[PDB]
Write an enzyme that holds these catalytic residues in place. Structure first.
Site, mmCIF file in Angstrom:
data_model
loop_
_atom_site.group_PDB
_atom_site.id
_atom_site.type_symbol
_atom_site.label_atom_id
_atom_site.label_comp_id
_atom_site.label_asym_id
_atom_site.label_seq_id
_atom_site.Cartn_x
_atom_site.Cartn_y
_atom_site.Cartn_z
ATOM 1 N N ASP A 9 0.870 -1.684 0.679
ATOM 2 C CA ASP A 9 -0.193 -0.258 0.114
ATOM 3 C C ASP A 9 1.133 0.922 0.302
ATOM 4 O O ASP A 9 1.603 1.327 0.671
ATOM 5 C CB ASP A 9 -0.684 0.016 1.174
ATOM 6 C CG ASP A 9 -1.811 0.653 1.113
ATOM 7 O OD1 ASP A 9 -3.226 1.140 0.927
ATOM 8 O OD2 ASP A 9 -2.053 2.263 0.115
ATOM 9 N N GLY A 10 0.102 1.995 -1.008
ATOM 10 C CA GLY A 10 1.023 3.989 -0.093
ATOM 11 C C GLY A 10 0.398 4.518 -0.993
ATOM 12 O O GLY A 10 -1.069 4.455 -0.960
ATOM 13 N N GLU A 47 1.863 3.803 -4.059
ATOM 14 C CA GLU A 47 1.006 2.411 -5.014
ATOM 15 C C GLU A 47 2.386 1.676 -5.431
ATOM 16 O O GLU A 47 2.511 0.604 -5.372
ATOM 17 C CB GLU A 47 -0.047 2.227 -5.491
ATOM 18 C CG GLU A 47 -1.002 3.429 -4.482
ATOM 19 C CD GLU A 47 -2.530 3.254 -5.605
ATOM 20 O OE1 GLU A 47 -2.760 3.636 -6.637
ATOM 21 O OE2 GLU A 47 -3.512 4.042 -4.655
ATOM 22 N N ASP A 69 -4.060 -2.923 -3.109
ATOM 23 C CA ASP A 69 -5.974 -2.283 -3.527
ATOM 24 C C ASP A 69 -5.497 -1.431 -5.448
ATOM 25 O O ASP A 69 -6.601 -0.472 -5.392
ATOM 26 C CB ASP A 69 -6.138 -2.050 -2.408
ATOM 27 C CG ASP A 69 -6.332 -0.887 -1.945
ATOM 28 O OD1 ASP A 69 -5.787 -0.147 -2.335
ATOM 29 O OD2 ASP A 69 -6.930 -0.424 -1.345
ATOM 30 N N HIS A 123 -10.623 -2.388 2.431
ATOM 31 C CA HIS A 123 -9.914 -2.326 3.694
ATOM 32 C C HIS A 123 -9.883 -4.271 4.688
ATOM 33 O O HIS A 123 -9.134 -4.451 5.555
ATOM 34 C CB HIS A 123 -9.519 -1.906 4.583
ATOM 35 C CG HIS A 123 -7.944 -0.972 4.127
ATOM 36 N ND1 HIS A 123 -8.117 0.199 4.899
ATOM 37 C CD2 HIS A 123 -7.200 -1.918 3.573
ATOM 38 C CE1 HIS A 123 -7.477 0.463 3.465
ATOM 39 N NE2 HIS A 123 -6.578 -0.912 3.296
ATOM 40 N N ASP A 133 -1.433 -0.244 5.456
ATOM 41 C CA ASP A 133 -2.182 2.001 5.376
ATOM 42 C C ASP A 133 -1.496 2.134 6.042
ATOM 43 O O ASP A 133 -1.138 3.573 6.249
ATOM 44 C CB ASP A 133 -3.761 1.999 4.801
ATOM 45 C CG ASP A 133 -4.314 3.263 4.402
ATOM 46 O OD1 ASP A 133 -3.751 3.877 3.896
ATOM 47 O OD2 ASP A 133 -5.013 3.023 5.279
#
Length: 151
Positions: A9-10, A47, A69, A123, A133
């Protein structure tokens, strides 16, 4: 048992602005965590960075399950990358594809492993993704690196 499970995640507080990534690597019932904050970047770039950082940390050819995601990574992977490469990494106007620096890095690293992509939505029910996250956002608050490929 040979497999590597990667979660990425970013994110960016303000975009463009300070951002960070979180990546969890599970290799041999030992979890490894990667996190960093950048002074000024974008959402799309974090991301992508999360996934780059995690693959680059494998010092050997593996069977990987990567879960993210990110719609941007997903779309690039499944739809755009094959064509960008045929076109010399430029769009119809002959300019370099946006975040080409990052896209090439990912392409290179995807070449070294057998990857199974798990595209996550939301999530809920995905504790590792949520955690990335949290890591992402925490890094972003204490940015320390420069995102020098960012325009």
């Amino acid at each position: 048992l040979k497999q590597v499970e990667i979660f990425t995640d970013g994110s960016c507080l303000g975009n463009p602005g300070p951002g960070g990534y979180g990546a969890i690597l599970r290799y041999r019932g030992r979890e490894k965590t990667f996190s960093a904050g950048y002074t000024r970047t974008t959402n799309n770039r974090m991301e992508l960075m999360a996934a780059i950082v995690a693959l680059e940390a494998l010092k050997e050819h593996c069977e990987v399950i990567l879960s993210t995601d990110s719609q941007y990574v997903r779309q690039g992977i499944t739809q755009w990358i094959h064509n960008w490469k045929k076109r010399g990494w430029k769009t119809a106007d002959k300019k370099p594809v946006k975040n080409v620096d990052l896209w090439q890095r990912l392409d290179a690293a995807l070449g070294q492993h057998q990857i199974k992509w798990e595209w996550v939505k939301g999530h809920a029910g995905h504790p590792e993704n949520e955690r990335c996250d949290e890591l992402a956002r925490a890094a972003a608050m204490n940015p320390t690196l420069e995102d020098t490929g960012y325009q």
